[PDB]
Structures are given as C-alpha cells and as structure tokens.
Ligand binder design. Sequence first.
Ligand SMILES: NC(=O)c1ccc[n+]([C@@H]2O[C@H](COP(=O)([O-])OP(=O)(O)OC[C@H]3O[C@@H](n4cnc5c(N)ncnc54)[C@H](O)[C@@H]3O)[C@@H](O)[C@H]2O)c1
Ligand SMILES: NC(=O)c1ccc[n+]([C@@H]2O[C@H](COP(=O)([O-])OP(=O)(O)OC[C@H]3O[C@@H](n4cnc5c(N)ncnc54)[C@H](O)[C@@H]3O)[C@@H](O)[C@H]2O)c1
Lengths: 394, 383
Amino acid sequence: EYVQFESRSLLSLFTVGKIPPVDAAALCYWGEYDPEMFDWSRDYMIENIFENLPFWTMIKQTNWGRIAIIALPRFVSDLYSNQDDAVQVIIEALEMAGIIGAKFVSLTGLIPSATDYGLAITKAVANREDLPKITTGHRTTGAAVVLTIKKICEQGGRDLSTEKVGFIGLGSVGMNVLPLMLKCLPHPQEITLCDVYSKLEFLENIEQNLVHKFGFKGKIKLALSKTTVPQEIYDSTLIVGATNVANVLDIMQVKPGTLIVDDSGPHCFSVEQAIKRFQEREDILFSEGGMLRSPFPIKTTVHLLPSVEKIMNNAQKEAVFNSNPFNIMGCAFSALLSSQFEQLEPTVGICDGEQSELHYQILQELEFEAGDLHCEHYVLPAKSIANFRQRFGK
Amino acid sequence: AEYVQFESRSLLSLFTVGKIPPVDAAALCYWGEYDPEMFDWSRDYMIENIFENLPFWTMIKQTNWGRIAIIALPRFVSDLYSNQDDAVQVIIEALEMAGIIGAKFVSLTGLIPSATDYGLAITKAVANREDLPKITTGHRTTGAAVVLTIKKICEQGGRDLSTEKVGFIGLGSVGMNVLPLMLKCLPHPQEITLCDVYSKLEFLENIEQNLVHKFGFKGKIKLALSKTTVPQEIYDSTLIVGATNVANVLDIMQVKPGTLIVDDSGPHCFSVEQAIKRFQEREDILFSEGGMLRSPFPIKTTVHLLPSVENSNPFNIMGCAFSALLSSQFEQLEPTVGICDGEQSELHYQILQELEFEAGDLHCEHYVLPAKSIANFRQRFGK
Ligand SMILES: NC(=O)c1ccc[n+]([C@@H]2O[C@H](COP(=O)([O-])OP(=O)(O)OC[C@H]3O[C@@H](n4cnc5c(N)ncnc54)[C@H](O)[C@@H]3O)[C@@H](O)[C@H]2O)c1
Ligand SMILES: NC(=O)c1ccc[n+]([C@@H]2O[C@H](COP(=O)([O-])OP(=O)(O)OC[C@H]3O[C@@H](n4cnc5c(N)ncnc54)[C@H](O)[C@@H]3O)[C@@H](O)[C@H]2O)c1
C-alpha cells in the first residue's frame, strides 16, 4: 500500500514526465566488499554490476517533500582508499540529483567520515552554481539518537538520571549526541567516553567541556579501545554507539538490563547475536539510533538494480513491502528539513553543533519521535519489551 | 570501428552524470513494422516488456555542425497510423526527454509526420507548454537530399536529366518538396508523369496547372492514378522518384532496362530484394535511397543497443534527422510543421552545397551499388 515496486528506471520515468521531480536526495553506497561473499573482484562489480554509475533506487514521499535515494557505484572501503575518486563519484551523483530536482543532498553512512565531513566535496565544487547543496545531516542524526535514548529509557521503564551511560565512538555523530543529550534530557549519574588510544587527548578535552561547559556533575570515565572496547564499558547500563568499526562491542557480555542505542552502520555489535540473546532471554533492549518515526505515513517507490532484482528475489525478501511506512532515517530527512526550514542550515565539516537543539525542537514540534525499537530487519515485539520492562524497570 | 562506438551503459544515465555532453538536436524514430511470422514474441509483449512504453535514446551522431540524439519511440509504425492520440502522447514524452538532454529542435522521421497531420497534431497537444523543444518534419532537407540524389544518379549513370522522362510516385509532403525543387535547381526534364492514388486526382490536376503556370515547365505532363499498384504508364518513365507511404506498389521487375530509381519511401515502394538480385544479374537499373546525405567529414556514432532487442557508411546521415541540426545552427532555416510551401527548400539546398554536402553514394538500405557495376551501367545505358 505505502510501498510499491517499479520495474522501470526511475530516471527514465522522470525524464518523460511520468514521475514528478524530487525536493532532496540522499547518497548511499553498496556496503562493503568481501571477496569471499561475491563471485567477482571488486573492480568487476564496480564496472559491470554498478556500471560505474550512480543508481536512483528509491523515492520517499513524505508530508514535507520527496527524497531520491541514490546509490554510489562504490563500496565503503573505496571511499576511504581514494578520497579524490570518492569526491568525483559524489559530484557525478550530485549532477544527477540536481537534474531530478534535489535542492539539498544528504551524505549518509560513512561518506562524511571519508570526505572530511563533506569539506572535500564543497571545495571541489566551489566553482559551480549548478549543483544542490550538500549536508552531512549529522545534527538531525544527533537529534534522532537523543530521541531514541528517550524512547529506549521509556520502553525500559527507567529514567536517564539513574543510568551509567557509555559512549562508544566520539566522532562527528557521537559529539552531536553527547551535548544534545545533556541539554534536553535528565543528566545521567555517570558517563564513560570510549574511543581509540590515539584520541586520548581528544577525550580529555571532552571531559573538561563536560564539567565546565555542559554542566555535568556526575562521574566521568575515559575508556580506551584497542581492537575491541575495554571491559570497563560493560559496567554501563545505557550504551550509545557511533563507531566507524563493526563488532567492537560483545553483545554477549553486556549485563542483563542494559539498553543499547547504536547509530553505527554496520553496527558496533553483532546484530545476529543480539537478536538471539533477546529472543532467548529478553534481557536487553537494543535499537538503531538514527531512525525517525514520521507522524504521517511515507509512500516509498522502489526500483531494484536489475541484477539485485533477480538474485535477491526471495518471495520473503519482500520484507521491503512490509517495512514500517512511518520510518525515515534522520540523516536523509535532514535534506528535507534544510529545504523546509531555512534556519536548519546544512552541515559540512565538524560543526559546533549546539544548533542540534534546533533540529530536536523542530522534530518535537512536528510530532516526530524515534522509530519503534528495531535493529536492521528485526523489530523487537512490544510484548517482549513489556516483559523486559517488568523485570528490569525501576 | 574508428567512427562507430558501442556503449554498454545507458546514454541517458551517462548524460545525467556529465560523462557525455548534451546534444544540440534530436530525431524521433520507431521500431519499423511488426511481423508476427518473423518475431517470436507478441506485439504487446514487446511494447510493455521490451520497450517498457518508454522512449529509448539509442544513438548519438557527432557531426561537424553539432550533436544529434536518435530516440526510438516505443511503438511500431502501424501503431502510429491506427491511434494518432497514443502516437502524439508518446511523442510528447520523447520531446520532454529530448529537451532535458539539450535538444533545441527535434526531427520527426519516417512516417511520423504522415501519421500526425505533419506535426500539427503534436503542436496542438503541446498547446501552451513552453519547455519542450521545437519539432520539425525535416522534409525541406529531405527534398534537398532527393534532388541531390537525382543529380548524382544521373551523374554516375551517364544520363542527362533534360532528356529523361521522370515519373513521380507519391506526391505527399516529401514528393511535393522534391518536384518544385528539382525544376528550380536542375535542368527541366523532357516529360513528367504524376502518379498518386485515385482519390487525389483533383490534387494532381492542380499540381499540373502549377507546373505550367507557376513553375514554368514546358515539357509533356501526364497523370496516371493508382488503384492499388502503380499503373502500367509509370514504367514508361526512365527516371522514377518515389515517396509513397505504401510499400511494394512499384514492380521492380517491370521497369525497363536503363531505368534510374530514386526512392525516399521507407519502407521502399519496390521490393529491395528483387532490386538487388536484378541489378547483380542484369546490371540494367540504378536504384538508390533518396533521403541520405553524404557529409564531407566522417561522423562519429555512439550506439547503445536496447538489451532485450540486442557497417554503416560513416559519412552518411539522413536528411530528415540532419534537418534538426540545421535548424539549431542556422536561424534562417525555419522548422516545418504541416504541409508547407516549397520556396524555402532552395535555402536548404544552397546551405548543403555550401557545406560541401552531396547525396549519399548509390545504395539501398544495407546494399551498396559497386562502383564497377555503375560503370558497366554507364557503358550499356549511359547517354
Ligand atoms: N545510516 C546513515 O545514514 C548514517 C548517518 C550518520 C552516521 N552513521 C553511522 O554512524 C557512525 C558514525 O558516523 P561518524 O560520521 O560520526 O563517523 P566518525 O568517523 O566521525 O567517528 C567514528 C568513531 O568511531 C571511533 N572508533 C573507531 N573504532 C573504535 C573502537 N574500537 N572503540 C570506540 N570507538 C572507535 C573512531 O575513532 C571515531 O572517533 C558510522 O558507522 C556511520 O555509518 C549512519
Ligand atoms: N527515413 C526518414 O527519416 C524519412 C524522412 C521523410 C520521409 N520518409 C519516407 O518518405 C515517404 C513519404 O513520406 P511523406 O511525409 O511524404 O508521406 P505522405 O503520406 O505525405 O505521402 C505518401 C504518398 O504516397 C501516396 N501513395 C500511397 N499509395 C500510393 C500508390 N499505390 N501509388 C502512388 N502513390 C501512393 C499517398 O497518397 C501519399 O500521397 C515515407 O515512406 C516516409 O517513411 C522517410
């Protein structure tokens, strides 16, 4: 009903006037390359499967405008391995996005992390006026994570003021979330800051700002990761993830009663292990952190890459047809917010991010909340959440 | 292979990312005629599953005077004549795509003008839309190409046009561009026969009066109507100029030895297979396409074949399609919609001569007439 498959090219349908222009776009990529998961080399897949071209695969029609979802013809490791090439393929996708009407384009996933948070792109297109404006969307993502912290505490039957909160990954998203959480939600009793060893001095400065600028009066701890998080992180009762490295947290070692909000993509813990533990014990709550729930249903048009349409053609793989029609990622929705509300300026670079409050406030005014607790394909059943709340609430 | 490049990826996609430049003009074509015997699938299966009811940008012709996109409508020719409303609808969808990729003018090739009131049904449906490119039938440039082919086929056959008995088969939009232009630019022939269907008799009689009282033709004029196939009187002509919208109305096996045949009809008004077979055995006719131009420079062609559907002379370009480029580069060459007068046709002829264009080398569809066999014809039947 709210999800429709389109076998014909969206680009073709647009150029003949059969579908209207969009107001915004969001750029994504084709996950990660693993030679043991595909029949072909990385170069073969880029040239012959992705055709070295951006691919317009989805339209999300919201109450606040239409967003095109456009996949770059790259894997995430390609973006990190040659920034010049990443910027060039992004500029190619921006030209397509402008033709189909986008005024603002969000850089989803790890594209900001790989492109100096967009600054490498804006420098390369400074001599052009024919392209949409770019945004990392991280202020909206930060607002979505804070909404999810609020939601997961409510669903768990606990107040944030009694939690010991562990932040795993204090990069662009993580440092949007932490100040906004302190500004908008009750302060927890303890905060642990966890990142890699080379960022010790960076974390020490955050600790100073926590005391003197954000007004945090609780206990502050620093925890340095090597290949995985240190064991002290498992003393936390609420874990907030935003890493660029998968599987650094062992979900089987979190204590019963722990709440986990994770914006990392791929997740900083094993999704399959989390689902298994939850189904067997119902003693954690865990969720994506970046997903918003719109008050109005969203109409999604899906055009699969004809390769994927045939191989990933399980009749049950049409879980797309049944994905929640109220959900939209905050990063992608940020491009619509910047076009609806001029004060929500696009973000490029590491930004001061106190304007994250403006994103949180406008989402609250529009009656957005965090998406219902879920992790990738798996929705946590409401009765199982109630069982957790009965046992581990306060 | 230096001038024809095959592209595996969508030209539309390549354009939208800036990998290929915009075009200056476009030309709309269609997928020929649907033969149920030859084809394996059905008509609706190919329209909905193979063409996807979408126009298909299949070629780019890079010339010394700009780039033209060749765009195939998702229809067969019989679909255009039977349903003018649907034809105009898919044409307007193709025009929107053509505008996006840069085309300022769009030629309506083949039988598209004949099936759409020569473009008037299109201009009526676009109404007050001000974003689409301008359409042209291109028939003034087609007419110039035919006159250039008449000149060339008499050059190579060793024949003088002033002594020929010329028979025109089909006096529609193209035919009535060719006839006045031939008289204006070439030596007047000895005799002209006008042949069209029975119901256009009064129309042909009016042409006859214009030949004597407007165009100053002093030779013999004869009218010969068709009921189905052409009348026997047409085979008395030594030069036959064809421009019909019906195939196989002229029997190539009944033309007299030494006959020259210039045919712009598509499909041709005679059997091409029988024409090639007779030429190789007897070498007693010269026959050629009439609408094909020869550029002085080789044209680079990019070809993107439609996947489900999936040796040209690099100097050759059809006059109809090239007309869209001419209108985009020369403001004085106005586009043609409807049945227009033939005064401006000399402008197209003079510009093509100025650009060192001539008619394509004698050929019919895929078959090229070997220059040695042309010399033999000039030996046996060349005045
Ligand atoms: N789905 C979306 O559209 C979307 C939008 C925004 C962010 N994200 C996801 O959020 C996550 C963070 O994005 P970002 O721009 O802030 O990236 P970032 O590169 O700026 O920050 C990542 C942080 O993770 C830290 N980290 C790496 N290994 C670690 C370990 N073993 N222990 C603790 N910390 C470690 C890094 O040192 C770094 O500080 C990414 O996975 C990204 O894909 C997804
Ligand atoms: N390849 C190209 O791009 C291109 C461009 C222009 C014209 N053409 C071809 O030229 C031909 C004519 O085009 P047009 O716009 O002038 O079409 P038209 O409909 O205006 O004229 C066709 C004429 O042929 C006549 N005719 C039909 N049956 C006849 C018969 N049995 N005997 C004598 N005359 C007969 C019609 O009555 C009609 O007057 C078409 O086949 C068309 O496809 C091709």
